[PDB]
Amino acid sequence: EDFDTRILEVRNVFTMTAKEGRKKSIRVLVAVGNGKGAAGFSIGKATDRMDAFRKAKNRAVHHLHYIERYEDHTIFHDISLRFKRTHIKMKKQPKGYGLRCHRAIITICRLIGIKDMYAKVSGSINMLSLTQGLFRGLSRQETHQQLADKKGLHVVEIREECGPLPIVVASPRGPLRKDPEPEDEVPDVKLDWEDVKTAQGMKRSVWSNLKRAAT
């Protein structure tokens, strides 16, 4: 009862058969989630659309992922991944930002319990690749405690609304290193031209930052 089910795709698949010619079947993709981090998806196939609905939703609850959420409202860090030809770039966002994402990602995020996130889907917009690509990326996000344990350092959050106050979000459970993390004068991290073009204001699009209903 704690889980809600959402449909992501309903397709009519047509199979050519040796004796009966073209037959019509239904392939359905549905996602399930309880709104508290536990969510999954499953494909359903049947001749009837309502039998497919039963199969997918019942199967989905046996293949649940657990998704880590920062402060139970957003992701822990920016996630950029490709699944086959579908690229998904997700950005950690503060409270009140809402879900400004592909409509399917919005639906999936409500099942997981993510309230604030930006996502951009490029390349092939294949619902299945998008769904399993999204769950693969959300299931491999490192939390702040995992980062602290891995590096044996404090994770300190600086918020502009709180000024210079250092907020320790995670501390290592084991011993605490004494040697500061090396300060590379210039990081060799790969950047997204879309993010840089935006930060500089060179990104002008009539479709970006449009007024939309609360999501």
Next chain:
Amino acid sequence: ETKKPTFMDEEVQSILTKMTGLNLQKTFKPAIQELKPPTYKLMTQAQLEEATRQAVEAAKVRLKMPPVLEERVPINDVLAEDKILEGTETTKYVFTDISYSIPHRERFIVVREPSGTLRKASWEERDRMIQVYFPKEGRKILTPIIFKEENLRTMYSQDRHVDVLNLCFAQFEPDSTEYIKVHHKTYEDIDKRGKYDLLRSTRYFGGMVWYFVNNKKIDGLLIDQIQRDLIDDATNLVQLYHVLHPDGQSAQGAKDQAAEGINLIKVFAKTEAQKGAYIELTLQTYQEALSRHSA
């Protein structure tokens, strides 16, 4: 001969700085405003202690007390009386020197009246004209209605005294009559309802103490400091009181009895305090709990 201290004396500022307190969680409370995604740093125990030290320094700047000024004297100076212009205009002209690099209290702002008199703008006209041509963020040309008595009681009921003082600081000059009237009405609402904790770890606590000490009404704040186990602050309050009222019954009693520490509060409670009974009782209770902890 012997001058009584000012609000900005290093001795008084030090006493009021400690009585105020520094709380980094309150001083840097999260603001309700347009938000950005936060940044994260990996820090050692030393890098964290340094970042916390820097935050304390940034807080001591944010807690810098505004100077307490006396009410400004009305401006009534006539520069010229050109009677030949009498009755030639129906509306008066306000002339403001907008030369950029001049302090606002040195800018000549004059008014040509329909009578022909060229006079210096009044304090109210000056602050209004400076806002017109040198608009300051948070200040309005017309006085906001929040400062009416009916609307301040609403803000006091919500325990928003610090917002009232932030609003008053932004709208009125520190020596204005509106600035002083609002601060005094706010300090009195705190004294009547015992809301002294609303101003701790803010830049407005010292001005509030300065008001109570000069008006000889520290009994309420002194009780609040004892009930919170802040005897170091409560003892400094009685010392600041003696420093600013040297020829007083309590200051002499402390000299005759060479009182120190908690003894000052007992001397003050008997001689000058109005609620002397409630202080001794409140002080007695504190000494008991301290003995229970010792034993």
